[PDB]
Ligand binder design. Sequence first.
Ligand SMILES: Nc1ncnc2c1ncn2[C@@H]1O[C@H](COP(=O)(O)OP(=O)(O)OC[C@H]2O[C@@H](O)[C@H](O)[C@@H]2O)[C@@H](O)[C@H]1O
Ligand SMILES: [Zn+2]
Length: 260
Amino acid sequence: PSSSMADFRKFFAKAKHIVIISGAGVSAESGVGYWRKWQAQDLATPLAFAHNPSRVWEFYHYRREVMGSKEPNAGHRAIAECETRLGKQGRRVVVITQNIDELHRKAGTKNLLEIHGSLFKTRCTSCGVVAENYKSPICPALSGKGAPEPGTQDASIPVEKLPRCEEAGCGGLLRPHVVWFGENLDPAILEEVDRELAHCDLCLVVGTSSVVYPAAMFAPQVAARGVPVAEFNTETTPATNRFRFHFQGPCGTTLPEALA
Ligand SMILES: Nc1ncnc2c1ncn2[C@@H]1O[C@H](COP(=O)(O)OP(=O)(O)OC[C@H]2O[C@@H](O)[C@H](O)[C@@H]2O)[C@@H](O)[C@H]1O
Ligand SMILES: [Zn+2]
C-alpha cells in the first residue's frame, strides 16, 4: 500500500463519487471505559433492556448528554467541508459511519448513512415508529440521571416514566434506535450502502479497526473492483494490505491535508 500523498491527490482531484467509511477513530480527537460496573457489551443488548429498561436508559441518557458537550474535530470538519465543496461541482461525497454519536452531522455532513443507528433517534417497542430526539433530558424522570461515577446507583425509574411513544393511542416504551449486540442491521440501510459502494470511484476508510462485520467488508468490496481505497488510521489494521493507500497518523492531521 502506498503512502504517496501526491498520488492520492491525483485521484482525489478527479473523483466524481467519494465514499468515506468511518469508525470510532474519527471521534477520538473529539474526546469520545466502564459506566458504573458495566461495559457496553453488558448494556447494549435486548436482554439487558428487557431486564432493566431503566438502567439501559440511564446509560443512553448519559451518552446523549455527554455528546451535547462534544465538538467535531478537524477530521469531521475536513470531511464536511469536502462534501460542501464537491457538491458545488456536482461531485458526490457520502459518509458511511459505524458511529452513533452524530459528530459528522454536527460538523455539517448532510449525506450520511448511519448503519448502527443514533443516540439521537428513538424506536417504539410497540408500534415500531422511529423518530429523531435531541431533547436534554429526553424525559423529566432522567434529568440528572445516568452519572457514571463510583457511588451512583440505579435510578429505578418506573417504566411508565421512561421515554414513551407520542403516536396517537400508542403509549409504548421507546428504546434507543441503535443496533444492539445480537441484532441485525437494517436491510434498507445496507441496500443504500451497497448502492454507494458499487458506484464510487474513490474510497476512504477512516479510524476503523476493519474487523467488525459487516462494515469490515465495505472497503475490500470497493478495492476488489479496482477502485483506490485510502486508509487513514493511527495503526496498520488486518485489512491494510488490501488497499491502495495507507496514511498513518491521527485523522485530524492527515484528512485536512488529503481533502484540502
Ligand atoms: N485519531 C485517530 N485517527 C485515526 N484513527 C484512529 C484514531 N484513534 C484511533 N484510531 C483507530 O480507530 C480504530 C478504532 O477501532 P474500534 O475501536 O474497533 O472502532 P470501530 O472500527 O468503529 O468499531 C466497529 C464497531 O465495533 C463495535 O465496538 C462498535 O459498535 C463499532 O461500531 C483503530 O483501528 C484505531 O487505530
Ligand atoms: Zn408507538
